[PDB]
């Protein structure tokens, strides 16, 4: 049936390679330069790296990316189709976690617009994922991919910000179909 | 470790002095890792992997070791040899 | 489709934060000490360790734990939802028991109230855990949850006495849901 | 839903443990003499290991345990339930296997009353153990499990004697049902 | 519920251990000199190794063996039951292969009659193997099991000629059940 495709995007990647007029950055150094002062912000735009404006998430680490600047369309030609939508997406969060250790993350998109990460290797936010979802039939140009990391704030003394220290990116497992 | 760096023969007279001999004295080589600490970039091992089935061992004997990747097919090595360059 | 999240919950951990007005206290200690004497308590209220009261169980070594006092409602905001209730519960008894050795607890709440502990890696009640249980839906903030270990007092020769010494820790895997 | 517990068996535990009334022996020291000569016994009443007694069966060593003296009802309170049924049981031999060797043995109780070991690391006697069986439902606390060994006899040339010989334990894998 | 028991069968065990009017013979030393001269014979009656005698299969080398030498009824006692029934056979080949080359072979007897021998590790002939069956139901006294390999002959160049130098043994695993 449809071109069952599986891409990995880096967002440590995506932040070093917006142009100089948006304000390109490094990510683990600015997670921990807006971790350890609790306010600040990243980027421009929907690529951009803040903590969150509204209320009870004004001390949670937000990591916004734009789909259009993932360039995805570019990676097959489009004479294979252009039904190119979403069928799921799972987070890596490479850190170094405890022993019994969780990572708490939020990956929103603006029940199956969320998904919860627990524990950041490979992870989608089922107990278990089952094709027979979350983020599916999201085009992959249109939207803005968030992953909000709650209690992510040092002065707010928060549960996680040591842990977001040694966070190096943020890899998202992109599987999309191409009808 | 101790390690026996002075060997010395003495006489001794019997009006309180010594006769002695100029001594055997040995050195060793050194264990500062402290300081001879040198870090080096390692391009040679492209796409290495221990998530995927990679090896650092040494087939064929040989005594230094080799990278194997492994499929369910086909093996694939990679000797170790020697640059000719410089060293 | 819910936020389905695994939180990771070791009770040495609440044991020994347990602010000292209440009394807080090392599990692996007081475990040592309440199993070689017949009698005794340790901490208060509901994060309690003592023994059984009821009838053929005051030889069983009873392990209490507060869920208001773990405060898993703080782990994410409550702009993203209000209701946090559990689909699961594992225990791991971590350095414990041999290669053909078991143990005897039970996991209970205060058929799906109880669970028996058998192997204490990961372990839960079933012998083929299927997604598709107990304590699926027990709020996160109510509640006690006791593990308690039949045959543990010495002096009556308990055969789980001699083996309840080793135990340095209960590791609590819970796997809620936020929808 | 049932305290679904485990509870491994070992009859080298079981027969050296017995009552000095009764005739207590090592299990290692006493299969290599049995099987050495022509057919023997050990123990007494129900724990006893000794050669079969009917017609095709005299030189097939046979291995007794009483599920009466497992004392599998003291493990756990009896306010937890009263009826304690088993849901499965595997076997696993401590022996030395052989470049192309099996294990012929036979689990009885006194279809689902057999079973067949065949490899003998945590072996059930299907080929897939699925569990949607042998040996369910029979009471803990009363019957007699038996474990034959066919063609067991060294003086009569058995293929199974020299496996025997090095056999150190018999490990009973008693899945069973609190409810 | 069927006594379901895994047995295996090494025919180089069967081959050397032939009584001497038959003849018993080296298995992996007759491959050599079957494969390495135009055709022969090694064994007699259906314990035998020869080409094929048809059309397009006089360049194939058949091993064939027969169920009643094998002598799978004497495993255990008769007071089992008599109903002994083949449930699976798979076949694993012990070779040394090229980079990137496969073993052919087809597992016959005397449609669910045949099967294909793709890699040789415990190698049944489906895609995945699914209990939910080829010679399922030949009983395991009567029948004769032959294993043909293609393209064998070293004079008439074939591609199999190579990989049958370096075999030292077939190996059979025969899942069957007693009821």
Same mark, same amino acid.
């Given at each position: 049936?449809?071109?069952?495709?599986?891409?990995?995007?880096? +967002?440590?990647?995506?932040?070093?390679? +917006?142009?100089?007029?948006?304000?390109?950055?490094? !990510?683990?150094?600015?997670?921990?330069?807006?971790?350890? %002062?609790?306010?600040?912000?990243?980027?421009?735009?929907?690529?951009?790296?803040?903590?969150?404006?509204?209320?009870?998430?004004?001390?949670?680490? %937000?990591?916004?990316?734009?789909?259009?600047? !993932?360039?995805?369309? /570019?990676?097959?030609?489009?004479?294979?189709?252009?039904?190119?939508?979403?069928?799921?997406?799972?987070?890596?969060?490479?850190? +170094?976690?405890?022993?019994?250790?969780?990572? %708490?993350?939020?990956?929103?998109?603006?029940?199956?617009?969320?998904?919860?990460?627990? &524990?950041?290797?490979?992870?989608?936010?089922?107990?278990?994922?089952?094709?027979?979802?979350?983020? /599916?039939?999201?085009?992959?140009?249109?939207?803005? !991919?968030?992953?909000?990391?709650?209690?992510?704030?040092?002065?707010?003394?928060?549960? %996680?910000?040591?842990?977001?220290?040694?966070?190096?990116?943020?890899?998202? &497992?992109?599987?999309?179909?191409?009808? | 470790?101790?390690?026996?760096?002075?060997?010395?023969?003495?006489?001794?007279? #019997?009006?309180?002095?010594?006769?002695?001999? $100029? $001594?055997?004295?040995?050195? =060793?080589?050194?264990?500062?890792?402290?300081?001879?600490?040198? *870090?080096?970039?390692?391009?040679?091992?492209?796409?290495?992997?221990?998530?995927?089935? *990679?090896?650092?061992? #040494?087939?064929?004997?040989?005594?230094? $070791?080799?990278?194997? =990747?492994? #499929?369910?097919?086909? *093996? *694939? =090595?990679?000797?170790?040899?020697?640059?000719?360059?410089?060293?």
């Amino acid at each position: 049936r449809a071109l069952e495709v599986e891409r990995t995007v880096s +967002l440590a990647e995506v932040y070093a390679g +917006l142009p100089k007029d948006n304000g390109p950055f490094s !990510l683990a150094q600015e997670i921990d330069k807006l971790v350890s %002062q609790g306010s600040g912000s990243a980027g421009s735009g929907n690529n951009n790296l803040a903590f969150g404006a509204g209320t009870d998430t004004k001390t949670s680490l %937000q990591a916004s990316v734009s789909f259009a600047d !993932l360039k995805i369309r /570019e990676d097959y030609p489009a004479s294979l189709g252009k039904i190119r939508r979403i069928k799921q997406i799972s987070v890596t969060l490479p850190a +170094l976690l405890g022993p019994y250790q969780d990572v %708490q993350a939020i990956l929103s998109y603006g029940g199956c617009e969320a998904l919860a990460v627990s &524990h950041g290797m490979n992870d989608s936010g089922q107990f278990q994922l089952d094709f027979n979802l979350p983020f /599916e039939g999201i085009a992959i140009d249109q939207g803005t !991919l968030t992953l909000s990391f709650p209690n992510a704030s040092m002065p707010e003394k928060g549960k %996680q910000a040591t842990m977001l220290k040694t966070l190096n990116d943020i890899i998202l &497992h992109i599987r999309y179909t191409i009808k | 470790v101790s390690t026996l760096v002075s060997v010395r023969r003495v006489g001794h007279e #019997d009006n309180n002095t010594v006769t002695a001999l $100029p $001594p055997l004295e040995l050195a =060793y080589q050194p264990f500062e890792p402290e300081q001879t600490a040198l *870090w080096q970039s390692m391009d040679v091992l492209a796409n290495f992997n221990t998530i995927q089935r *990679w090896q650092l061992l #040494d087939l064929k004997g040989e005594g230094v $070791p080799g990278i194997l =990747y492994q #499929d369910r097919n086909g *093996w *694939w =090595y990679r000797s170790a040899q020697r640059q000719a360059g410089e060293e």
